[PDB]
DNA sequence: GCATCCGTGAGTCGAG
DNA sequence: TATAATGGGAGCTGTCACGGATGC
């Protein structure tokens, strides 16, 4: 629900 | 710039944009005035001859929206540019006279 | 209360029809400059000026009074609209 | 004695029998005389006009 | 004249400084007069101490100072300036590595100063910051609505200073904690705090079945670190559980004094409720690397003890005034200061990274813009910051004492049910039960009681006298509601001989409950009845005789009273009318004993004992926020000996130092020809003749001349196409001359604007050709007097660009202000009211000969309908009228205190003494009883008013003692058929005046998008014909009228134009067209990707845009 | 001829409870909880209250004001709902032709006596007045024809007949049973109550219904 | 209302109640296209069923439904009426999906359009009524006789 | 929001007939302004409409003949009075205006109940129905004297009250 | 013709493109100096029409 | 079937 | 245009009742 949190999570997968 | 939706008051009931007038679209009064002006102009132009009213209408753009040169109005009536300048000047002379007499078009001078 | 309002409501099946008849009649009177009136010179509605009695400018008052006389005919489909307008413009030019 | 209810009834019956225009006239008349008499009647309120019953 | 005061109640203490709730609060907040080293950590000081040191290089706070204001108050009001002081802070930058120290005093901007009277001047306008009531922080226990045998524990910090935490015992038996809408087992958090199964077992074991519900094996198995990471994964899912991140987050949520602040009041309430001591304002601590519990275990313990039904444990009443506190000016302002400071700190930390890590001063590190912005935002745009109400001095005095439950960090209006709007028993002596707004805000906006003061913690306290044995001391104790609940408090009117209680049975309160009690059981006693009510309510005489609903209106309406040129204090006062004027600061008094050297309209010079010569300038014809005139008049003469505290000048709405909100008029209570109908009021033309109810009002007009891309606007006397008649009262520069009378349509300031580029229509070409006159470059933009306004020009202010001391907003060459004044006589539609809630509009002004009159020829002033009394149940006005009659003839005024007043017998006595003067005079003058007086006496004994058989004089006196007299109808000469109540009543002219409210519009300005008329008199607006109005027209079946409202009279453009032209041509109005707002609706639905199609009967598209919107 | 008494009796102003507060005792007051105080207010406004009594009264005053304030929004909202639901209903014709109708009961079963008793006058008038008769009705030797709008007199006659045991209920045309599409018809509607006569075709009847139900809303306690 | 001393005719409450009972729910579709549990106006199912039973088809079995004034108002055939009431997005999404056509039957629709409402002087019953004076009337009559 | 509308404080007008209201002249001059311009043209008060309007713009340029003209304009016409909240259809009624000096609208006592109007400072709005049709609707359907009974109960709405009752009873 | 009905329906991207007089390619509103609308922006005269009549 | 969560509503006109 | 620099930050608490989808 929080686009920032989502994006940070995606970033953290690399 | 500032938001038209900027709130006025502590109630949610009013916006800033609500206090801003429209200066673009003519008011009922202004529209009325312009109409009356056209009608008084036609009334005054009817006191001329058809030809000398037509010369003025053609020269000032009341017809077709464009202001015709003396050479064009003259060529349109089959007369000389000097002839048309002359009938335009005597037309305008009669207009000014009828104006001094009836005082009709004065109030539209603002 | 409008004078003879009860009798006027008497003349109609629906009060709104009274309103329509009155309104349209007043439009007729205004359009033809009252010279189409069914009233007689002593029946003409009057208005008190500083000068004195003059014709009542109000067409709705006129129309209601006219209606009260009985000399007006109202209903649906009495005559084609164009024909009515033209016959009226022939009888009372503008 | 004429009071709210009787006067209301009067108005209604007058509406039925005499119609709108006359009832309007009746209403204006009732208004006029009512006011007129109300002023000369000598109705007022002093503190002694609220009367404590001995029974209290 | 003589002033006779009633009542036996002796008040041991005077009313407190009335604006002290404002003044002391702000004084404490700024600590300006305290030398920096001696400052307590509170207010601004506390904000700095909280924000600093800023760690990351380390920036630390030393001390702050406040300078003097750049401009005085009068100047600020004149120039649209905020009255304020420069704030500086001495900061030292330290490099912990190097040891290096750079220290400097940085300028943080300005902070607004409170004036002497407790108000502010913010951008030229006077404002009040209203105190805000709210729930006190602390730890509360409320019953759980779902499960009866269970409870909810709520931990509440200060607003914006933390999340609330709720402790609950779930149906499954496990104890849950709710934070930021997430719930978890409280046991986990306890484990993070370092609790072990042994400690919890020994501690909470006494309450049998719950502790096992607290027991969770897995949690006790894992050490506090694993529990901290686990808790963090519960609170912040998806965030990788780095241990330092977890420590930081939990600390920030719970133990961080920067992010979590219980009140000082929060702390005190917690300590008091749970019986513990807090090391600080946080729920836990971070000490020696781990977390240490503070709050949670005592609250859990109390919760369990309560559920178990252990004696000594109670639920909390959240509307109890022990649990509800006031946030005053200082606290609110300080909050915003703290916010701006935290932002400034964010900026500092960011600057401590970029740039050179070596060369930095404190001046380079600090940007004060966020702080300035937070404060400017609070004072300008907050809801609690209000345009001051200064209609009359009492208006502002009351405004400053108001208490709001609304505003930021508080209730919305839907959030307010019955519970909050209620009068709590604890409101006694603290918040007035009477003075609150009628309507939607009822119970939300309230007023501080007269003897009440807000303590340092923010709880309202009320004074009581100690009673030892049966003896009442003079020692007063201010108590909060919570402490008040402990004692048995006797009523203030309980009989006394000396200091001893003289009654065998006394009326007292125990926890608000009324009770009959022995003098031995009396611990305290009320100071006065005045302490129960607000300042406005305390100004209503015979209040005990007025129903509360009407008394409310009386209170509120005194606020609306307009200062009158002839204004007088009431003939019946309550004894507060002097104090109010004094505290208001409107009236002027002498500092020490002395002699008056000079007396002028403009100033008073006094030579004191000191020998020093002090000059007091007087404010003359100044315009208040509401446009009433504030002006001071000298009450002393040259060479007069004055003492300390003696009156020098009267302020507005005061007479010889007494509050004058109105006039004393001779009133008759009786119907008059229906002009009295339904609260309407009839008055005598004599009132206008003698200038009673006449008031001065000043309106301010303003105009700017600015730079345009088309060339400069100019303020000039040269205005295109205008007659000398039109320009007559304008000076060389184009500004109207002082002293000129201006009427609607008249020019105030002449201005020209460069005409926007346009091609003249061929019609204008022909016209211009006919008259041979060039169309001017400029248009007439002049400021004119609006419809219904106008008066005498009393002032002009002009401010140009390039002249000393003045700078305008960008683009603005010059600003002109014109002040226009008017003397307003009372007229039909103006509103009058008394202090008892009787209010009405003036419907008729009769010539004096039509006015009802006394036998001796004296006509009455006002005629009030008796029908207004019985349903309203306000009898105070009646008693006021009677005592006013007595006073009218005896030539005296009275002070009848609230609830200890003049009673009926005394009023009868005064009335008798009055009758002697009213009659005996006549008998001596050689006149006997009138024939008509005899007739009236006949009808009167028929009414049982007089005793039959007594002499006419005896009977007339019997009537006069009932406050009734014989009254003659000025029209007939015949008497009114019965004796009528006549006397002096105090009546005020309120701020609602027909002149201000009357408005009409034919055509006018329209809105941009909707093309519908604008709103309001000020915009020349049209009336709103709303949904309900439309319903009315529909129910009448009036279709064409309704259609007119929807089209020709609103947003149908073609239609309204055509209608105007038709009406001025005498033609009937045209058939209406499509309303522009429907086209707007269609395009707005197209913007939403919905296709809206108007169709004909054949289901073919109809184009209402007439080809204009289609390609 | 006392002024309070005269005003009260005439209906010019005042009602008994208000007069009771003036000359009588003020009476019992209620706590904020709604629970009543044991001690009443013995004083009357003529005598004047005691600060404790006055304060005790304020709770109820305030509760009343809050009641009102919060009620006007609820009534308003209701009215708007009613308008939105009934707005299309108009008298669109003279007779829909239905044979259906409703029988207005003149007797309510009484619970305490467990037997029928006569409904109150005004209730019957509210259910009867200005309605078209569904079937012919003969009572007390008078023939009320089918299709007759009931005058207030007609209603009084039916009530007197009911007292004489002649008739226990009245067949009547109603909007409930009306078959008119998008509205009602003149007959099923009846009197336009404001004119005491048959409603005119075209009257927007739904709006009037909503306004009629909605207007008193702020007075309901 | 009676308890508050408010005299109000049953008639009005009946108009409202009538609108409350306006709708029905299908128990069995019969030979129609309708679905079981589907809700529709009583008028429409009566017309449909008389169209089916006169066609020799099994009629729809339906049940009376009572819905409150809010729901009833929101369920009306007119989408301008419903969307101006409340729940504008819901009303408008379903209306827009369905390709719904507002027939401008009631008052609100016409008011929104700035039209002449179908009540009072706008009613089709009294709307077209003509007035003519006897002189012009007879003149026209002679004119129509001579053709 | 609509044109040809206005608002002011209301005052009792006992002397009024049931079909009348007091309407302040200054309000009337604005509300009827276009009609007034036309009439000012018919009578010689102004050369034309533009001059008439220019003449009404300044309050000191207003002579007494325009008031007589305005009296002529409003003849037989009615205005709508409205008071908020408009709870039922009698929240709006039609009255024939009687021009009055002074800034207050004068309201007839008998209609106070239907408007729930009183004299404690209530204000009302005025509207001018423009067309022959609207004016007809107002005079016939909406006129105060023509609606005497409650559309709700059928009982009399405009009826004696307060002072009137008091006097008659006395 | 007279309007007897109002239809409301979903709009294809095709219909939305048929309504459109141009594509707004730029976040620009009006020019900071001239105050005239910026080309291809939200106020563009080439898209939504001329600011002044017949000019 | 019955808890439960989410979304949607909550009087009018005036002024500001 | 090049030292190295590698996962955010502010939360908002005193309604209240209903319709309707969704969940064990
Ligand atoms: Mg009022
Ligand atoms: Zn029917």
UniProtKB/Swiss-Prot annotation, chain C:
InterPro entries: DNA-dir_RNA_pol_omega, Pol_omega/Rpo6/RPB6, RPB6/omega-like_sf. GO terms for molecular function: DNA binding; DNA-directed RNA polymerase activity. It holds the Pfam family RNA_pol_Rpb6. It is an enzyme of class 2 (transferase). It catalyses: RNA(n) + a ribonucleoside 5'-triphosphate = RNA(n+1) + diphosphate. Its EC number is 2.7.7.6. SUPFAM superfamilies: RPB6/omega subunit-like. Promotes RNA polymerase assembly. Latches the N- and C-terminal regions of the beta' subunit thereby facilitating its interaction with the beta and alpha subunits. The RNAP catalytic core consists of 2 alpha, 1 beta, 1 beta' and 1 omega subunit. When a sigma factor is associated with the core the holoenzyme is formed, which can initiate transcription. This is DNA-directed RNA polymerase subunit omega.
Swiss-Prot record, chain E:
InterPro entries: DNA-dir_RNA_pol_bsu_ext_1_sf, DNA-dir_RNA_pol_bsu_external_1, DNA-dir_RNA_pol_su2, DNA-dir_RNAP_su2_dom, DNA-dir_RNAP_su2_hyb_sf, RNA_pol_bsu_bac, RNA_pol_bsu_CS, RNA_pol_bsu_protrusion. Its EC number is 2.7.7.6. It catalyses: RNA(n) + a ribonucleoside 5'-triphosphate = RNA(n+1) + diphosphate. Keywords: DNA-directed RNA polymerase, Nucleotidyltransferase, Transcription, Transferase. The keyword Secreted does not apply. Pfam families: RNA_pol_Rpb2_1 (PF04563), RNA_pol_Rpb2_2 (PF04561), RNA_pol_Rpb2_3 (PF04565), RNA_pol_Rpb2_45 (PF10385), RNA_pol_Rpb2_6 (PF00562), RNA_pol_Rpb2_7 (PF04560). It is an enzyme of class 2 (transferase). One of its GO terms (biological process) is DNA-templated transcription. GO terms for cellular component: DNA-directed RNA polymerase complex. Coiled coil: none annotated. One of its GO terms (molecular function) is DNA-directed RNA polymerase activity. DNA-dependent RNA polymerase catalyzes the transcription of DNA into RNA using the four ribonucleoside triphosphates as substrates. NCBIfam families: PRK00405.1, rpoB. The RNAP catalytic core consists of 2 alpha, 1 beta, 1 beta' and 1 omega subunit. When a sigma factor is associated with the core the holoenzyme is formed, which can initiate transcription. PANTHER family: DNA-DIRECTED RNA POLYMERASE I SUBUNIT 2. Belongs to the RNA polymerase beta chain family. This is DNA-directed RNA polymerase subunit beta. The gene is rpoB.
From Swiss-Prot, chain G:
The RNAP catalytic core consists of 2 alpha, 1 beta, 1 beta' and 1 omega subunit. When a sigma factor is associated with the core the holoenzyme is formed, which can initiate transcription. Belongs to the RNA polymerase beta' chain family. It comes from the Bacteria. This is DNA-directed RNA polymerase subunit beta'. The chain holds residues 1356 to 1502 of 1524 of the full protein. The gene is rpoC. DNA-dependent RNA polymerase catalyzes the transcription of DNA into RNA using the four ribonucleoside triphosphates as substrates. It comes from Thermus thermophilus (strain ATCC 27634 / DSM 579 / HB8).
